[PDB]
Write an enzyme that holds these catalytic residues in place. Structure first.
Site, PDB file in Angstrom:
ATOM      1  CD  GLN A 171       1.758   8.015  -2.379  1.00  0.00           C
ATOM      2  OE1 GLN A 171       0.804   7.664  -3.069  1.00  0.00           O
ATOM      3  NE2 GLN A 171       1.971   7.543  -1.158  1.00  0.00           N
ATOM      4  CD  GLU A 177      -3.083  -0.933   0.244  1.00  0.00           C
ATOM      5  OE1 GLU A 177      -2.857  -0.885  -0.982  1.00  0.00           O
ATOM      6  OE2 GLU A 177      -4.224  -0.801   0.728  1.00  0.00           O
ATOM      7  CG  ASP A 178      -0.771   5.247  -0.150  1.00  0.00           C
ATOM      8  OD1 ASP A 178      -1.861   4.642  -0.200  1.00  0.00           O
ATOM      9  OD2 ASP A 178      -0.499   6.221  -0.884  1.00  0.00           O
ATOM     10  CB  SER A 179       3.962   1.191   3.445  1.00  0.00           C
ATOM     11  OG  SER A 179       4.198   0.026   2.681  1.00  0.00           O
ATOM     12  NE  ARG A 181      -2.379   6.612  -3.616  1.00  0.00           N
ATOM     13  CZ  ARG A 181      -3.288   6.197  -2.745  1.00  0.00           C
ATOM     14  NH1 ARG A 181      -4.387   6.894  -2.506  1.00  0.00           N
ATOM     15  NH2 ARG A 181      -3.094   5.049  -2.103  1.00  0.00           N
TER      16      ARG A 181
END
Ligand SMILES: [Mg+2]
Ligand SMILES: [Zn+2]
Ligand SMILES: [Zn+2]
Ligand SMILES: [Zn+2]
Lengths: 142, 171, 112, 262, 650, 81, 97, 131
Positions: free
Chosen positions: H88, H3-5, H122
């Site tokens: 982000q 994920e965004d990690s 996004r």
DNA sequence: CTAGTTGATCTCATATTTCATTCCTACTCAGGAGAAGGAGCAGAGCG
RNA sequence: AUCGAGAGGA
DNA sequence: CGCTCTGCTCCTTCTCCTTCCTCTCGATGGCTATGAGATCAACTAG
């Protein structure tokens, strides 16, 4: 009254003497179960042997209780105890009123009336008179 | 006075005692607990009528802990005094202001207030009995008492014994 | 007729976004809104003013204003409601608590 | 607000749905008693198709030529052909299917043939073949008596309820009405012989699974359906919507009242 | 000590003034609390809940730990309306026969007969009120419906009844022939209400009598409801309750003064409102009337109602949902090397949260060692609870190397491997959002989840944080593991479709892996095979042999799929050759077609994930999730995949 | 009313969990164990093993809404979970 | 950490009755009280050192029970008493069967 | 970095990347008014960092003030949040040694590795142009 | 076992000279929907 | 220590 | 057909109202009078 078996059982006003007889019966039942695992003096010794062997002897208060009740029982010969049951119950006497008459000493209706305020107002002294001498004579037999 | 009644006791069993011996273990616990018990509604509990025929009706395990709860019924023989009744008792100890007499499983305080006015304390008597009137009452002598109501106490149950009446006197 | 018509109405709402909810869950909801004999709104003045326990009823929107009525009418709570048992910290009669567990003594004696 | 209304609705051991007060909201949960986690979108074959198309896939005749079962299908060939006794059985079950067809098309006016249902039959059929490599190139050892009897026998053991009483047994008949309609659709003798050349060992094992698997979909008593239903509606809600708040709040004064006249 | 039981039914009702007088253990007379430290015997005396270090609490002892207070008694000089019952009182009086004690209407009227037959008491009263209120007279003789000429001599008063109106804290009745209504008059009328009338009104004989709707004495809640305050350097700052009541004492004491001394009637009237006003505000400082009780600081008085109404009231903010313990909160992060039902827990937390393990032969030796470790080595405990309750603390004791454990003792063991826990992401919108995981302890300060389980939580690794809860018994552990374990939630009752699946890279990677064009060398296969713990040590024969042993992708992926799985999905192009290579088709855990994508390992109902659950049970399908992840990920690591600006340029 | 018990003989997940938790609680309390101990020290896993061959000495009491109930001995329960 | 309203609604849906109690009782607010069965009001005088109990007003010395409730609950009833409301708590249902 | 990690070079931290200082200032009051109230801080008898500056002064009332400032070093651990200039936003999933990271031929080794999936869903094309 | 001085506690006095005031910015939210109560009206029975 | 106002994240 | 009576319809009032977590600031919690004199009890010592 009502028992815990769902049976509407009348108030069992067990007489002192017959209550002691039932106590001896239950003690003998306990004796039989544990293995499976009469005058004042004679009855007084039997209770101690029964009571001592049913427990460790720590219940001394109930030990003294049985002798005192044994010291004051009015109908000891169980066969003759059966006599005094119907003499009072068969007459329609209240079980509560039956208990003290079969557990206490009396000779004449007035004394029973004097001793028992409840009987003073609604008891047939004629029935009391006939019973009391029979019981008074019966009491002497013991 | 004396009665036969079926009483129910809700006993608990610790989980460790759930072995095959649990039935007779509960039997023993009930036997040791019921014996010599006091209650206001019934007075004193003497013995259990119909010792056999033990009513278990299944035990319930409490949700909090495994310990099992058993609502054990049992036919029992008890003693229950009542007001205005005739009692024959015995004197256990003597007192300056009365007597401590035993009525079967009941200890009755025979107060001096309810004795005949002609009955007086005799200090010189051994035991310190009342011997100023006909109603001679002492530890070694018999006594009859009248129960003018019952008094309940946490430790035990006692009542009032009266001698100032035409009946229920000494002996 | 309302119960069937109502469910159709809710279905249009859910189907608007394309998400699909099993018919059971919608079916139960509409029914609860029409068992009383009318479209009992789920607002404060609808569902809440039912004959359920006050303790259940109080916790939703009006707490004291109900408790007064319960006291005034000597209302009674059977303590069968889940919220009534959480308030008193007792095992609610649900899931694992919808029954009781008893010891099979005769089997226990046999097992030896 | 939605959870509180349905906070305390649970499925009791008599399969009925009640709230705390005991009011009976639903006599059978979800009108079928099946847990929602054992349902799949399954196709109902008996609904769609033209009348002839349905007949061809299902009709079996041992006397005439239009629907003459191929003798090679079973180890017993001509012996079966011409037997009125079995022909009567086919006449009965086929009549049932026609009744089901006319019944189903009444329930689903739109004609859509896919709906959630318990136990995915097809996977059972497909799994059965691979279980012991069913050879399709040899005659099967089944008999028309074996097939039709098995189907009826299975139906009686799909017990949602248990009440021996007349009222309950009537409900038990209604509860599995739709599912059993599907069952007969995909356990027809013609398909069970032509489309799925199953053996006695295969057929017997299959039914023992339908019996077992169905009983797993039974909604478990004690379920907290009310909370579960409310949440299953609340989650999609937060993902029209003024309409939703316009409904739960009855709000007699609506936004855009409108009719729809046919 | 005393028998234990569990509450079965709650009966509400109004305190009888006699009952209040009986239960109270002390009469309150002085508005003063103290002198320097001693307390006025007529207020907050030791006969109420004692303060700390005082083992009296009205001869209750037990300090203030396990013994609550005991209510008090204030005898109001004059009766005062109860705020909550003003409305009902208005309703009740409109029906009574106005100094006669009877109902304005009787069963002789048919309408009442209908109302009297209503089972529901509450509705019964409402209909009565609608009809009785219109009755403006309580005439004695009432014509009989059966015999119009015959009249029933019912109304004792026989006079009229005024039109009552609501006016703040007092009632005014307009007489049809007008004055303020005295509180005492209502008591007199209510005292004359027959028991029959109660039930027709819905009241109760022994739990709610109308005369109890008027306050003649007020219970004084004990200190625990208004705790002693020492928030400053020995300053009191007592709760609003303690100050608010003192005003009533001042008002009450004043009231008794005017009447006794000269009885300046006019003066008494106003002071009565003050007594009533203070009670009303104390009972409820929120009313339609303007008067708003204000604290000396100016803040409105936090009435008893304000302690319950709305969120943060004792009902919702302290009973429906409450603070708890044995729970930890931190941030999350994905970890493909971790199965579904697992979760990484920082050692710095597993060293803090503890479980009360019991000492038994099965684990006495193990527990013995943990005690030796102490509360700082992770595999250790924080306390040993003896039978007597002596919570021996190893942190401040050398006894860890000295104690001999005893059967039945409890050990505050740390969290160890496989100890069930319960995750919960706020908002816990729906059922899936709270699930039970096994524990693996990791050496970093953030929670570790498997990737696929994020969707049911709706969670993310962009800074989202989750909450962990720990069971404290051998039972509650069982409830979680057998009911709330992650595998049991693979199929969601929401929509019958599995709520989990393969997401993010492992979904993009797998598609690349199962193309018709991907061919895998021998060496890169052996490693991939070893990454599937299900692997049985048997190397599948490569699809291509002669020029070079060269496995196709679908071969390797199919090693992870369990045996005995048979899936068949056909799209428009699938024609048993699938020139487009679409569709999907498997046999005994061996892929034959298709590009494994969302419609086979996603959240689709017919997908692979859904099928496996039913054929092998949730416990097996759970292991599937990891094994696929451990294969594709290892492959993708060694094949890589990126995006870039040029991709967006047409 | 052991005669004609109308509840299904299949042991519901809820009582599966409750019996397992209960028996594990007793085992942790050093209660008697009705099966051989194969070194499996976990009380809960011991409980599952006991349930495997029907050694749990417990009987369920399923309360119908009326109040009446049925006593189902875990032996006759059909564990399919 | 708070165990909010929606957080128990998940537990109820899961059917974890026993766990829900533990969170609400053992985690916090565990409290033992005494109740007069004659009048279900927390007025008992629990002389634990003397092993004596009584309910002034009922003069009862034989009908007493231990009851476990959250401390918040005890606090709730007491205020309900403060406004004359008598939340009588009885341990036996009126209707037996 | 699913994920965004994100993944962050561990060595790049060891060389100081995103190292930060954390200054925290404490304030202490001598006592209240002189009306029979006294208190002091003369070592009466019976966070993490090092004190930077101890400031002793008196308000206009002459009451002694003590202000303490303790500084500490913040080094990016796992989970510490970061964000680009385009919205982000993601945390540090895990850190790798320098050698373990992928490297171009020219020996450059990424400091930070993000996930492609962040981009398309996004619509942050600008982040691509900046890079 | 009492009497010694000295701490503790109770009571009150002088009592000054002593508080009501300064209003005030300031203004829009945000309205919707449901219960409750009165007021007038129209028609149904009655005279 | 408690209220109030604020500044956010999930 | 008016009178009267009642219920029906209409028309204004008259109310009540929203997941979890983290920090900082800051105001604040409050008003109440002097000890002296005298007598009794408490402690110690012979
Ligand atoms: Mg997020
Ligand atoms: Zn106390
Ligand atoms: Zn009147
Ligand atoms: Zn009481």
């Amino acid at each position: 009254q009502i028992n815990h078996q769902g049976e509407e059982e009348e108030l069992i006003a067990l007489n002192l003497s017959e209550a002691r007889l039932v106590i001896k019966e239950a003690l003998v039942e306990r004796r039989r179960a544990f293995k499976r695992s009469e005058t004042r003096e004679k009855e007084l010794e039997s209770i101690d042997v029964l009571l001592e062997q049913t427990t460790g002897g720590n219940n001394k208060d109930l030990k003294n209780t049985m002798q005192y009740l044994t010291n004051f029982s009015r109908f000891r010969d169980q066969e003759t105890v059966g006599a005094v049951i119907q003499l009072l119950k068969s007459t329609g006497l209240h079980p509560f009123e039956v208990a003290q008459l079969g557990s206490l000493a009396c000779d004449t209706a007035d004394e029973a009336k004097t001793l028992i305020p409840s009987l003073n107002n609604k008891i047939s002294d004629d029935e009391l008179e006939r019973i009391l001498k029979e019981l008074s004579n019966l009491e002497t037999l013991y | 006075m004396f009665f036969i009644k079926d009483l129910s006791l809700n006993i608990t069993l610790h989980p460790s005692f759930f072995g095959p011996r649990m039935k007779q273990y509960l039997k023993t616990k009930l036997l040791e607990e019921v014996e010599g018990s006091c209650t206001g509604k019934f007075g004193y509990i003497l013995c259990v009528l119909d010792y056999d025929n033990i009513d278990i009706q299944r035990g319930r395990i409490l949700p909090t802990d495994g310990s099992a709860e058993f609502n054990v019924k049992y036919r029992a023989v008890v003693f229950k005094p009542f007001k205005g009744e005739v009692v024959d008792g015995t004197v256990v100890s003597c007192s300056q202001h009365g007597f401590e007499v035993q009525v079967g499983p009941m200890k009755v305080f025979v107060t001096k207030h309810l004795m005949p006015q002609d009955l007086t304390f005799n200090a010189g008597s051994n035991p310190p009995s009342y011997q100023s009137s006909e109603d001679v009452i002492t530890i070694k002598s018999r006594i009859r008492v009248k129960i003018e109501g019952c008094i309940s106490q946490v430790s035990s149950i006692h009542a009032i014994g009266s001698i100032k009446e035409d009946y229920l006197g000494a002996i | 007729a309302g119960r069937a018509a109502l469910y159709k109405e809710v279905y249009n709402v859910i189907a608007s976004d394309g998400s699909y909810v099993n018919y059971r869950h919608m079916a139960l909801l509409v029914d609860v809104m029409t068992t009383q004999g009318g479209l009992t709104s789920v607002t404060r003045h609808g569902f809440n003013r039912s004959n359920t326990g006050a303790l259940m009823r109080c916790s939703f929107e009006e707490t004291v204003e109900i408790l007064f009525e319960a006291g005034a009418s000597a209302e009674l709570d059977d303590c069968r409601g889940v919220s009534e048992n959480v308030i008193l910290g007792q095992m609610a009669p649900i899931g694992t608590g919808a029954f009781d567990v008893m010891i099979d003594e005769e089997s226990l004696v046999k097992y030896m | 607000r939605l959870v509180k209304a349905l906070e305390d609705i649970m499925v009791h051991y008599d399969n009925t749905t009640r709230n705390s007060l005991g009011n009976v909201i639903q006599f059978i949960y979800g009108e079928d008693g099946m847990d929602a986690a054992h349902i799949e979108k399954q196709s109902l074959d008996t609904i769609g198709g033209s009348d002839a198309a349905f007949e061809k896939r299902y009709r079996v005749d041992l006397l005439n030529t239009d629907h003459t079962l191929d003798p090679s299908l079973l180890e017993s060939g001509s012996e079966i052909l011409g037997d009125l006794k079995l022909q009567v059985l086919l006449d009965e079950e086929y009549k049932q299917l026609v009744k089901d067809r006319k019944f189903l098309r009444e329930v689903f006016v739109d004609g859509e043939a896919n709906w959630p249902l318990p136990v995915n039959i097809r996977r059972i059929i497909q799994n059965a073949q691979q279980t012991f490599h069913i050879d399709h190139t040899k005659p099967s050892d089944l008999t028309i008596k074996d097939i039709v009897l098995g189907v009826k026998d299975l139906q009686e053991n799909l017990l949602v309820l248990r009440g021996k009483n007349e009222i309950i047994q009537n409900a038990q008949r209604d509860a599995v009405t739709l599912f059993c309609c599907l069952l007969r659709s995909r356990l027809a003798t013609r398909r069970v012989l032509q489309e799925y050349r199953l053996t006695k060992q295969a057929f017997d094992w299959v039914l023992s699974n339908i019996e077992a698997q169905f009983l797993r979909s039974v909604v478990h008593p004690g379920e907290m359906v009310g909370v579960l239903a409310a949440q299953s509606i609340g989650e999609p809600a937060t993902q029209g919507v003024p309409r939703l708040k316009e409904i739960l709040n009855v709000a007699k004064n609506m936004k855009t009242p409108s009719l729809t006249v046919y | 000590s005393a028998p234990l039981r569990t509450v079965k039914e709650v009966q509400f009702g109004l305190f009888s003034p006699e009952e209040v007088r009986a239960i109270s253990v002390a009469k309150i007379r002085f508005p003063e609390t103290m002198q320097t430290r001693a307390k006025i015997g007529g207020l907050n005396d030791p006969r109420l809940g004692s303060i700390d270090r005082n083992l009296k609490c009205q001869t209750c002892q037990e300090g203030m730990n396990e013994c609550p207070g005991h209510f008090g008694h204030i005898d109001l000089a004059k009766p005062v309306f109860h705020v909550g019952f003003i409305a009902k009182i208005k309703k009740v009086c409109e029906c009574v026969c106005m100094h006669c004690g009877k109902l304005l209407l009787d069963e002789h009227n048919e309408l009442m007969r209908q109302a009297l037959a209503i089972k529901d008491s509450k509705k019964r009263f409402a209909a009565i009120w609608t009809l009785c209120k219109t009755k403006m007279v309580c005439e004695t003789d009432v014509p009989s419906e059966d015999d119009p000429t015959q009249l029933v001599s019912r109304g004792g008063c026989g006079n009229t009844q005024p039109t009552i109106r609501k006016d703040g804290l007092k009632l005014v009745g307009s007489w049809k022939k007008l004055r303020v209504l005295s509180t005492e008059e209502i008591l007199n009328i209510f005292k004359h209400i027959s028991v029959k009338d109660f039930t027709s009104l819905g009241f109760n004989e022994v739990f709610s009598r109308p005369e109890w709707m008027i306050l003649t004495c007020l219970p004084v809640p004990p200190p625990p409801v208004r705790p002693s305050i020492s928030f400053n350097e020995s300053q009191r700052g007592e709760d609003d309750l303690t100050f608010k009541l003192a005003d009533i004492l001042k008002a009450n004491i004043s009231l008794e003064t005017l009447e006794h001394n000269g009885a300046p009637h006019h003066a008494i009237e106003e002071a009565e409102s003050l007594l009533q006003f203070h009670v009303a505000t104390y009972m409820d400082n929120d009313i339609a009337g303007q008067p708003q009780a204000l604290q000396k600081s100016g803040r409105p008085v936090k009435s008893i109602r304000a302690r319950l109404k709305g969120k943060e009231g004792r009902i919702r903010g302290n009973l429906m949902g409450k603070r708890v313990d044995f729970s930890a909160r931190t941030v999350i992060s994905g970890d493909p090397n971790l199965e579904l039902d697992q979760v990484g827990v920082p050692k710095s937390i597993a060293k803090t949260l503890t479980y009360p393990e019991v000492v038994t032969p099965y684990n006495i030796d193990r527990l013995t060692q943990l005690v030796r470790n102490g509360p700082n080595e992770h595999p250790g405990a924080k306390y040993v609870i003896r039978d007597s309750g002596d919570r021996i603390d190893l942190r401040y004791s050398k006894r860890a190397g000295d104690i001999q454990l005893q059967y039945g003792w409890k050990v505050e063991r740390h969290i160890m491997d496989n100890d069930p826990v319960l995750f919960n992401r706020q908002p816990s919108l729906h059922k899936m959002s709270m699930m039970a995981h096994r524990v693996k302890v990791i050496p970093y300060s953030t929670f570790r989840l498997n990737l696929s389980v994020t969707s049911p939580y709706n969670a993310d690794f962009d800074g989202d944080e989750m909450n962990l809860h720990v069971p404290q018994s051998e039972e509650t552990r069982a409830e979680l593991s057998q009911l709330c374990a992650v595998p049991l939630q693979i199929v969601s009752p929401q929509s019958n479709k599995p709520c989990m699946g393969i997401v993010q890279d492992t979904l993009c990677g797998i598609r690349k892996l199962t193309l018709r064009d991907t061919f895998i060398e021998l060496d890169q296969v052996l490693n991939m095979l070893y990454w599937v713990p299900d692997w049985d040590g048997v190397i599948p024969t490569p699809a291509i042999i002669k020029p070079k042993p060269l496995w196709s992708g679908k071969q390797i992926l199919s090693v992870a799929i369990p045996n005995g799985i048979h899936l068949q999905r056909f799209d428009e192009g699938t024609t048993l050759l699938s020139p487009k290579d679409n569709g999907m088709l498997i046999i005994d855990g061996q892929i034959i077609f298709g590009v494994v994508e969302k419609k086979t390992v996603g959240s689709s109902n017919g997908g692979l994930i859904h099928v496996v659950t039913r054929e092998k049970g949730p416990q097996v399908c759970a292991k599937l999730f990891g094994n696929i992840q451990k294969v594709v990920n290892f492959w993708l690591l060694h094949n890589g995949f990126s995006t870039g600006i040029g991709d967006t340029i047409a | 009313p052991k005669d004609q018990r109308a509840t299904t003989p299949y042991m519901t997940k809820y009582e599966r969990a409750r019996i397992l938790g209960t028996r594990a609680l007793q085992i942790s309390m050093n209660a008697p164990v009705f099966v051989d101990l194969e070194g499996e020290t976990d009380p809960l896993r011991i409980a599952m093993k006991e349930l495997a061959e029907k050694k749990i000495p417990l009987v369920i009491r399923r309360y119908l809404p009326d109040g009446s109930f049925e006593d189902w001995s875990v032996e006759e329960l059909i564990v399919d979970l | 950490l708070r165990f909010g309203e929606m957080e128990r609604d998940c537990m109820i849906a899961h059917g974890a009755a026993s766990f829900l109690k533990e969170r609400l009782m053992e985690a916090s607010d565990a409290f033992r009280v005494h109740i007069c069965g004659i009048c279900g009001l927390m007025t008992v005088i629990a002389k634990l050192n003397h092993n004596q109990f009584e309910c002034k007003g009922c003069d009862n010395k034989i009908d007493i029970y231990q009851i476990h409730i959250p401390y918040a609950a005890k606090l709730l009833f007491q205020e309900l008493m403060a406004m004359n409301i008598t939340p009588r708590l009885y341990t036996d249902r009126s209707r037996d069967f | 970095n699913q994920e965004d990690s994100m993944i962050m070079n561990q060595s790049s931290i060891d060389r100081g990347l995103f190292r930060s200082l954390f200054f925290r200032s404490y304030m202490d009051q001598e006592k209240k008014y002189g009306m029979s109230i006294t208190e002091t801080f003369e070592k009466p008898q019976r966070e993490n960092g090092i004190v930077d500056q101890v400031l002793v002064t008196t308000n206009q009332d002459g009451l002694k003030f003590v202000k303490v400032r303790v500084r500490t070093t913040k080094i990016p651990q796992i989970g510490d949040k970061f964000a680009s200039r385009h919205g982000q936003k993601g945390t540090i999933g895990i850190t790798y040694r320098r050698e373990d990271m992928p490297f171009t031929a020219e020996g450059i080794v990424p400091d930070l590795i993000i996930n492609p999936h962040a981009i398309p869903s996004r619509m942050t094309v600008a982040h691509l142009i900046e890079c």
